[PDB]
Design a protein around this ligand. Sequence first.
Ligand SMILES: Nc1nc(=O)c2c([nH]1)NCC(CNc1ccc(C(=O)N[C@@H](CCC(=O)O)C(=O)O)cc1)=N2
Ligand SMILES: Nc1nc(=O)c2c([nH]1)NCC(CNc1ccc(C(=O)N[C@@H](CCC(=O)O)C(=O)O)cc1)=N2
Ligand SMILES: Cc1cn([C@H]2C[C@H](O)[C@@H](COP(=O)(O)O)O2)c(=O)[nH]c1=O
Ligand SMILES: Cc1cn([C@H]2C[C@H](O)[C@@H](COP(=O)(O)O)O2)c(=O)[nH]c1=O
Lengths: 264, 264
Amino acid sequence: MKQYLELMQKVLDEGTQKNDRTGTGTLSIFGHQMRFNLQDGFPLVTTKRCHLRSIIHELLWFLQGDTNIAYLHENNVTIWDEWADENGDLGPVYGKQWRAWPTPDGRHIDQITTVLNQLKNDPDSRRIIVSAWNVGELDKMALAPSHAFFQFYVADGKLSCQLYQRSCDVFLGLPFNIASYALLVHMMAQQCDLEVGDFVWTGGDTHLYSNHMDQTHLQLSREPRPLPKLIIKRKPESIFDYRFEDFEIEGYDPHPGIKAPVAI
Amino acid sequence: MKQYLELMQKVLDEGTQKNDRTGTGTLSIFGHQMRFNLQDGFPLVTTKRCHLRSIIHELLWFLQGDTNIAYLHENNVTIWDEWADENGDLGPVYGKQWRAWPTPDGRHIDQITTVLNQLKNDPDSRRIIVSAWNVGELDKMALAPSHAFFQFYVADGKLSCQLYQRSCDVFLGLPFNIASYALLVHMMAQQCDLEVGDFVWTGGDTHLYSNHMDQTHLQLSREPRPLPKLIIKRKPESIFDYRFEDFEIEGYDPHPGIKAPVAI
Ligand SMILES: Nc1nc(=O)c2c([nH]1)NCC(CNc1ccc(C(=O)N[C@@H](CCC(=O)O)C(=O)O)cc1)=N2
Ligand SMILES: Nc1nc(=O)c2c([nH]1)NCC(CNc1ccc(C(=O)N[C@@H](CCC(=O)O)C(=O)O)cc1)=N2
Ligand SMILES: Cc1cn([C@H]2C[C@H](O)[C@@H](COP(=O)(O)O)O2)c(=O)[nH]c1=O
Ligand SMILES: Cc1cn([C@H]2C[C@H](O)[C@@H](COP(=O)(O)O)O2)c(=O)[nH]c1=O
């Protein structure tokens, strides 16, 4: 996509070589924002083939409040394998904070049900937020939340969402993260009877890993194709009842996939 | 400042009329980002006089972990009066989350000391974050955290910081919020022996209140003056030992102040 290839080029032209946690090394910039009008098409990268199966099942797993990778394995999705322990656990990452944030006094808060109630009863609220950055449980998480905090906004009957992503692997992570949150906005808009507005992505440390440079130059030579259209075939009873089969991505015709190593 | 007056104009040209919590009504946009290179000057608005006394003491109060307004009153700062209860309490807002985030198992986490330790021992970390959005205590807070989440970044010996502000009163709140966080970056950089880099401000619902329109048009006719220079006269033993007298803002010569009503 235009916005995405502009960011890849910006990291190549402006990024600082930086060491990182994995020992791979990165070219890095800090602070970037891009906006996707979801009315223009579903923002799935076309200059390389993205594995939709992994994107959709990872979002359905988050909405279940699940942090064990068994569900992903049942559905042949292996993207979280390298961080899980012997029992397949990841600790209280995304799904657990979204669905069951533990309070100091022992209660659990379901942020997704809270957001539904706010969108249905107080759409003008400036407080419609979900946060996975639970400071008191960071030490139990396999990987600290990268897409950490997001906010919904309603104006003129359209639902928008902004994500703050503290750390962004531009070649591998970001195509998945954009499609995942664009999908959640479509689901939320359908459940609340709203039209989809904008998805606003904001990044903190936005980086290309040093061993993704050949793949980056290859993808940068490709022309973006027309964005596909997302079709949700059914309106489930709730946001927690969607099924993989309910989604149709129409007209997706990408350039070939480009493999790249994951930095662990 | 150039960036600030460009945002005011953008809200006037592109904002949607929106109802809000206070009943005042706003012109609102969602998702904006601006960057201030702190090497260019201290980003204190010059097209209206800002009350530095309130800005500096509010930051020192946050760093103490204090949420009762008595300290502010001792220093003749009245900006939080309308939200405090009979005992002057605001509930577990900013200072308390920054200095003593309560964990599910009863521990308290001092995020500021954690950040100091990360900047001193692992400056390349992509996880150097402070969050005031504590989901399990939102219901005890007088006002939900508006400047909610921020991240530090170190590259080429320079310290940068990005703030996610979920809700932004452009005329009253934002001049104070920009100066406050720019001041914290200078303090952190001095304590860690770094140069100051960029302050990146990212907003969610960014708005002008309907009864600030005359004040906005007046300020938009003024030309920005040169930015002042911040001088910290002393290096305290720690980030918690700064005093009001340690700060000097040199060459601040603003246009006259513009009064405007606060929406409660
Ligand atoms: N270094 C790093 N970058 C990541 O983006 C990342 C990470 N670490 N930690 C875990 C994680 C979880 N999400 C993801 C997303 C995509 C792939 C991935 O390897 N995608 C490949 C193959 C997809 C497949 O399994 O079919 C791709 O080519 O997109 C891995 C993990 N993301
Ligand atoms: N509607 C709203 N907007 C705010 O920016 C705001 C709020 N509510 N809730 C509390 C709060 C706390 N921060 C602030 C910042 C500035 C002023 C204020 O009134 N500033 C005036 C006078 C400063 C003074 O007391 O000397 C100004 O003209 O800047 C109030 C509260 N900020
Ligand atoms: C989980 C996840 C990680 N990442 C990234 C960002 C970093 O490259 C790495 C996480 O490492 P970090 O915790 O040191 O920042 O994986 C994404 O880009 N998207 C994701 O969804
Ligand atoms: C505390 C604080 C509030 N605000 C704002 C944003 C909103 O106008 C209002 C808070 O209301 P809200 O919680 O309904 O968003 O005050 C700032 O802009 N800066 C601040 O530091």
